[PDB]
Structure 1
Amino acid sequence: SLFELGKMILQETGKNPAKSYGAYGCNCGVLGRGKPKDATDRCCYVHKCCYKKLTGCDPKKDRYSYSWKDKTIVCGENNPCLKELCECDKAVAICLRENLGTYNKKYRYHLKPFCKKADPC
């Protein structure tokens, strides 16, 4: 759920999840997908596609387990969906961190500035 994801983003990026990625580009946020603005945006794009493939579990509300031992996200055993959900979030937190170098605050928004269509995931 948003609790795991959010905590992961914070752990990987050190940034406030909602503040830097709640509304960022075309894919970081609660507004669906769009043509990636930049490497941070592309991370969220893939994240949303990662969710799409999921089957059965609610990526927004299903709470799952994961360890933060040695400051690396270790997805808990869980079940297939939950494990896959966790990996989706882990993956985006990491990607987000790895792309902090090009993170551009200018892509942060109040209301998504209209975005180009996003490749069918």
Structure 2
Amino acid sequence: NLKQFKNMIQCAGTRTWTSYIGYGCYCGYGGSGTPVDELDRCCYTHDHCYNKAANIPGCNPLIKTYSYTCTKPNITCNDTSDSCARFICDCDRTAAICFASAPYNINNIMISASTSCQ
């Protein structure tokens, strides 16, 4: 769930989730346009992942609690049987790791209303 994703974010990286509340065209809620950079592409992918999670029975991305461990900076998704849990933990882990490895361009904070995301 979302609380687990937040913790994964600071497990794998230096910046916490609040850092990605308003970034580029896709970090945070919804979004449109072309992801402006690597980080924004991370968010773009996560969004789609969550939206695909719905196609799984009894699976709501924001509230589904999965099993995972953090051995800072390593995240491990434990689920195998519970497909919804496993799929969503993967969405979140992938994003958390993507955020950590991607550069954070301060120039791209607050651009969603600009020509960039059109």
**TM-score where L is the length of structure 2:** 0.83
1:113 maps to 113
Structure 1 distance, partners of 2:63, 2:79, is 18
> What is the identity, as a one-letter code, of the residue corresponding to 1:22?
I
Runs of 4+ in 1 over 6 A off after TM superposition: none
1:26-105 correspondence runs (5 A): 26-54=25-53, 55-56=56-57, 57-69=59-71, 71-77=73-79, 79-99=82-102, 102-105=103-106
Residue segments in structure 1 that go unaligned for 5+ positions in a row: 117-121
Q: 1:75 to 1:53 in 2, by over 3 A?
A: same
Residue segments in structure 2 that go unaligned for 5+ positions in a row: none
Provide the aligned C-alpha RMSD in A.
1.9
> What is the identity, as a one-letter code, of the residue corresponding to 1:107?
N
Contact in 2 for aligned 1:75/1:87 (Cα 8 Å): yes
Structure 1 distance, partners of 2:67, 2:32, is 26
**TM-score where L is the length of structure 1:** 0.81
